[PDB]
């Protein structure tokens, strides 16, 4: 009844997973992860890559696949009682997104930042690259989409047309593929050194600012709460 | 670590490191290890690399597993960037204090301005002990002696916490009240402005005045303690003293130089011609940190990294003494797994198939002549 | 659905918390990427906290988000902590990284890689916009303050790092020695930065109008 | 993405024969080099980059095209 | 009756003229056209210039002059039967424009491209400059205007107000005067060499993209066909 | 400097490190052409199908 | 050296000397690839007739 600790899943699922990761690199950062031309890299680190990409395509197909088919067809008439329960679960999806972004855009990002300072890169595939770009980012993008779709398929208001701020919020993440990938790409001609002030990194900054579309998304979410028959009891009682 | 993946010809024709030496192979926390040697900036410096107008003498390690206590190019201490001059040879000396227990592959590298860390040979050095043992003491011109490991740590923390707390305090004050869906709607139908009132705007300026106040108080309080302070010292050191080398007595001419496709060896046809007056033999070809020796002629004692030293890697078609006045053409082959391991073989992907090295010649009584060669290096597949 | 106007209070509350978490970490995430991407790492090193470049670029490049989320949380909720939420996001995000990575992962002293202090400014921004609720006013004296306050705002942390040392025959400040030792791989400056923050606050006030946008598509 | 990526492999069958190695007068050169040398005028990260970039360009130009489709009249 | 091979004129008139030109330079490219300081240049090539400029001002004045005066005054009531015939002739004008542009913007342009590679220029007035800039461009601009005016003066729909895409389509050509002329102008300070990637050439690219306004012009032309009583017989019979 | 003769006489032979000896005048010409025609045709084929 | 300390309108005063460009020229100063030998005064209180 109402909004459960199905939420506690959402918070701990990343926390545990990513804390296992931080341990995992923590021990193989040094050991295998230093010299990429050693065969212990092609097993502890490269295989890790292929594993995750595959797992991501799959879970993405399953996760979006699931929700799009369990899209509520008879949305036209379902109670305000559930138009709340659902609105709340949607908010859990957003907490999961925001948490997922934290890890990607703050944690593993500025971590890679430190890593560059301490070893000259042997590949575009350092440990922290395997984790920052090809694990961390796909995850928060998948979470992103999930939420979007949940809202579109589960709640009226959001079922009517496309939310521009919500589209920007989930597509910005996805556009950071080359944006953050041009980091090392762009910086190679004029200056190969990974200077974060270089124009090559400006795409990451622009796509990072699309996270501010969360403000427009939350405004629309709270308007979906008010349309669903809420915000009138205690609001008027105030 | 980090060479290998970088362009093989960049590595051949950028900086040549030789007469490298390391005072110890195993060292206790807080102990010193001293790296010495020489480096030559190659006359045919690559276009893609800004000339070293502003270069920096760095150290190639996994972070501060050692701290650099001192560094010297020529006689001079080099904490800044420095202007090195193409063609010239210099002697450097890095002095490292050990800080983190472990096995480190320490390199000596150049921070070569516009594009490139120019990484020298790396040698494995082992630190034994506890990081908790490490001290980094420094005495100021101000009287006090401090430990750089922890100096000013608590201060940093305080001021960040304090300000952080105040940030929280501010959002905290507003968040005693409900935050979103009521305040949103109030703004909507009808006016807001019931949302904020007196008991609010007094606190607003409370904060505002309190903040400016604490900043200025704090600042001129920080000025009261610590009244003697300088700006960050910076700026490229010019006038680096280069090494005065005697004109070499041997001259060599590189006619064709080839490498086998899937291979581990580079052949070159040299005309060595011995001016000056003592029968000379060829003892080493140094190329990209990789050193190839004729052990019939020369033997490393400096403990040069084992993966880069090819003990009898270098074979000369005729390495008998070359008499003074005499001049001969000889076929030379530098061969060793290191050629594939450090990817000099990756020259086949480079846009400029030209190599560059140092040859070392030795006379009868064992004093040496260094000539430098460079030439196009051509693949052979069939 | 909604039973009593007392349970209605409970939902709006358990919403407040959830939303705050979203807003906050989505800021932490995107704001941090922005600091990162548009920087040459002065924030990383105690010996890049200088009088010209650090003092100038930092307040300027950072007014952006505050300015943008200010244009929303105040306009649409009269919530006057727009600026300071942003700033706190960046700071937490960075500290967690500097502690567990810059120190924990690879071993750089904290007294070396600590970040720049940002709150004072954001308070000035937040309060100046709250009192006299004119954005134009904030953009001028608000951004002015944000710029100016910055360096004096860091001075108590920074100053001890600038004591002179004769290190092996050369004058160096502690901070210099730090960067030298731990191996990696002039209030016109203030005014400039304040004067600049104004156009940036301003430009970003309108950028934020767009991110507040509530349309649907097809 | 595709447009960017496909491009080089798309030219490779035409280009490749031009990249056979030749020792031309003592210097390695590809046929292509010799060609430019003779006839006198007066690395899949590159691919990815170009794909990643094409996206913002396709995008920006999608809207530029909205304007060139514009059907107004003036005065 | 309907739409004639008055069209065959339009296609062959350029084709013949420009094929005569390609012969003409073909023989005097080498011979006179190499050294501009020889007196055979001031006759076979310079005189050619003065001749064309004069011929262009004239024919332009005559061609536009003609049509603006023969503007259909009593447009208000004339049959759908001719609102088609005219619509078709208009389309011939557009075929003439497009053909004229082909020669200017593709043919003589990339030809000049080759010419630069093979001789260092003695003047801003090389053969291929006399032809590319001061023959080829004026011609397709004159054709451009003609069409525009024909439409404005001959067809309702286009008689009402100014078509923005059609104005862009004919004025873009005309703006390429300095745009393509800055080619050699701009490239003289930082780098005199005619590097096509130089910012001096960006005006030619921007004015070349105004040719895409043909899509908006054609959409409006087909809407003029539908308003004129057409597109209802076979269209509804489909 | 004056050149006498026929352009049809000109040869530009070059021997590769790969064994083969080719004429730079015409080397790889047919290949270039094929691949361009083939792809060009497919472009036409596509608009053709719709048209 | 300065040929005179006090001078009448339309009279000449000649400044001579030597200058060395310091080998350790500062980074912040473009090398003198294009330098100009000027005179430090409040405008044309004198006019520069010649410079060598």
Numbering used by the authors:
A (entry chain K), E (entry chain C): 45 to 282
B (entry chain I): 33 to 414
C (entry chain J): 7 to 191, 213 to 245
D (entry chain B): 150 to 191, 213 to 245
F (entry chain A): 157 to 207
G (entry chain E): 53 to 104
Provide passages from the article that reported this PDB entry.
Methane-oxidizing bacteria play a central role in greenhouse gas mitigation and have potential applications in biomanufacturing. Their primary metabolic enzyme, particulate methane monooxygenase (pMMO), is housed in copper-induced intracytoplasmic membranes (ICMs), of which the function and biogenesis are not known. Activation of the 105 kcal/mol methane C-H bond and oxidation to methanol is accomplished by methane monooxygenase (MMO) enzymes at ambient temperature and pressure. Structural studies of pMMO have focused on a single biological assembly: a 300 kDa trimer comprising three copies each of subunits PmoA, PmoB, and PmoC. The pMMO trimer, resolved by cryoET and subtomogram averaging to 4.8 Å in the ICM, forms higher-order hexagonal arrays in intact cells.
To investigate pMMO in its native environment without the use of detergent, we conducted cryoET STA of pMMO embedded within isolated M. capsulatus (Bath) membranes. The cryoET STA structure of the pMMO trimer embedded in the ICM was determined to 4.8 Å resolution, and is consistent with the structure in native nanodiscs. The trimer architecture and folds of PmoA, PmoB, and PmoC resemble the previous crystal and cryoEM structures. Densities corresponding to regions of PmoA and PmoC not resolved crystallographically are apparent in the map, including part of PmoA (dashed pink ovals) and segments of two highly conserved PmoC helices facing the interior of the trimer (M219 to L254) (dashed cyan oval). These regions were fully modelled in the recent cryoEM structure of pMMO in native nanodiscs, which fits the cryoET STA map well. Several densities not accounted for by the pMMO model are also present and potentially correspond to lipids. Although the side chains are not resolved at 4.8 Å resolution, density corresponding to the backbone of the helices is present in our cryoET STA map from native ICMs. CryoET of these membrane vesicles reveals that the ring-like particles are organized into an ordered hexagonal array. Analysis of the four distinct trimer interfaces contained within the system over a 100-ns simulation showed several interactions between the PmoB soluble domains of adjacent pMMO trimers, including a strong salt bridge interaction between K60 and E338 as well as more transient interactions involving residues K58/E160 and R167/D339. There is a moderate degree of conservation for K60 and E338, while other pairs are less conserved. No direct protein interactions were observed within the transmembrane domains of PmoA, PmoB, or PmoC, suggesting that the inter-trimer contacts responsible for array formation are primarily mediated by the PmoB soluble domains.
